């Protein structure tokens, strides 16, 4: 009974983009669901970052208290390609990362979502700065990666050597994509995909057939460019072993409860919540599951987006599976 419910405000991006919900509107909706853990993206909803003033940070603290919510996680970004013709120097990357540690500290967070692409060497070099702010750094593991991917294995080598409890991981539930997501398949057909070939792709997805086989096969049976791009989604969405989480539980700081579609039954239609949540309980997980709605980008061409409703259903699903 120690798994906690939260929401990444990324879930409300469509309404925030359209100026239908403010930053505080998002937090309010979140508290109304009993999802008191808040995850935020300063570069998404806090214009003026990384130059936010004490009036903002004090106001965010007062907002959290007013709603009974907790500022849990800050999601950093790292624009290594900010300068045309080159990448940031390692020192420029450290400077950018320290920005986010400072901000997460002032926001009251206990963990930062470190982008999946961040190198072990950068994690190592910024560690003293994290230590000074007692800030956990959780590298996101998202599709098509998993805890046995060689990039993650190399990150683990570094964390084993450094021996710091502040370095760890944030699994994204898209590494538990059990079925080809329906809203993805449906948008592909709206874009002109061949329905017979989409059905082949969805079937082969469930069968766990190698991605490169499905791609070449769709090519070989005369798939159009949309069909081929549909097949190539198998390179970007994956199932992984849920019991592998048990090996890394001390480093699992936070979970991105990614979802695309909650049906009227309060069931998520493609991601492996019923397999993963029992494992987190078996492992003694005491962190947050933070709703991360991404259905908007797939349905927005033909349907109104209702992120609050989708997150309400998702939170009811989480509560049931946690055993509240």
């Amino acid at each position: 009974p120690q798994i906690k419910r939260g929401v990444s405000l990324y879930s409300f991006q469509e309404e925030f983009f359209l100026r239908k919900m403010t930053l505080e509107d998002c937090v309010a909706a979140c508290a109304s669901m009993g999802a008191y853990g808040i995850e935020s993206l300063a570069e998404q909803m806090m214009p003026g970052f990384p130059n936010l003033d004490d009036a903002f940070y004090d106001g965010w603290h007062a907002m959290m208290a007013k709603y009974g919510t907790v500022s849990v996680c800050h999601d950093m970004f790292l624009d290594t390609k900010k300068f045309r013709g080159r990448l940031m120097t390692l020192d420029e990357q450290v400077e950018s990362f320290v920005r986010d540690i400072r901000h997460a500290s002032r926001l009251g967070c206990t963990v930062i979502r470190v982008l999946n692409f961040v190198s072990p060497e950068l994690m190592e070099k910024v560690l003293p700065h994290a230590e000074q702010s007692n800030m956990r750094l959780g590298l996101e593991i998202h599709a098509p990666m998993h805890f046995e991917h060689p990039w993650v294995l190399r990150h683990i080598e570094f964390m084993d050597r450094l021996g710091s409890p502040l370095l760890g991981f944030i699994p994204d539930m898209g590494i538990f994509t059990k079925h080809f997501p329906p809203v993805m398949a449906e948008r592909l057909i709206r874009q002109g995909a061949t329905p017979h070939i989409i059905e082949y792709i969805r079937e082969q997805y469930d069968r766990r057939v190698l991605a490169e086989y499905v791609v070449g096969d769709v090519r070989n049976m005369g798939g159009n460019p949309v069909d081929i791009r549909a097949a190539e989604m198998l390179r970007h969405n994956n199932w992984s072993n849920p019991r592998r989480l048990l090996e890394h539980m001390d480093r699992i700081f936070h979970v991105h409860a990614k979802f695309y579609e909650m049906d009227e039954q309060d069931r998520e239609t493609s991601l492996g919540y019923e397999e993963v949540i029992p494992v987190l309980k078996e492992g003694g997980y005491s962190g947050y599951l933070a709703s991360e709605y991404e259905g908007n980008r797939h349905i927005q061409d033909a349907f109104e987006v209702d992120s609050v409703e989708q997150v309400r259903r998702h939170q009811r699903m989480l509560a049931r599976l946690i055993g509240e």
């Binding site: 900010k82 045309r84 980008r297």
Partner: protein, 125 residues
């Protein structure tokens, strides 16, 4: 992503030597202007070269060709930028087509991230 929202309705206005209109960035967070690697603008199907384009974000107007120096000028999430197109002739009244094709230099993505939109805008006076 957010493609249907790139060209802002009711925003086409005349300026000396051309037109201005509102543009939103098809991305889920704010992005420094320097990583708007391409923004291909068409007015009435005619391309506006990069030397005739300026971007206004808040109180800052920058020539599009100088965006490389705007590494920390943020096109905020959902923020409408005023894009100004210098044109070779005055635009008559009524409706005109405005097209914008974005390619974004996203650091964790290997190729330009793309978003495209076109809308029929009336010349609002």
């Amino acid at each position: 992503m957010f493609d249907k929202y790139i060209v802002v309705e009711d925003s086409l206005k005349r300026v000396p030597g051309g037109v201005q209109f509102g543009v939103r960035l098809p991305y889920y967070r704010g992005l420094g202007l320097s990583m708007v690697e391409t923004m291909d603008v068409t007015v009435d199907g005619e391309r506006v070269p990069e030397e005739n384009l300026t971007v206004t974000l808040g109180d800052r107007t920058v020539p599009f060709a100088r965006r490389d120096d705007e590494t920390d000028t943020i096109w905020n999430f959902g923020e409408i930028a005023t894009v100004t197109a210098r044109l070779p002739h005055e635009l008559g009244p009524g409706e005109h087509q405005v097209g914008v094709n974005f390619g974004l230099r996203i650091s964790y993505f290997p190729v330009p991230m793309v978003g495209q939109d076109a809308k029929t805008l009336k010349l609002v006076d």
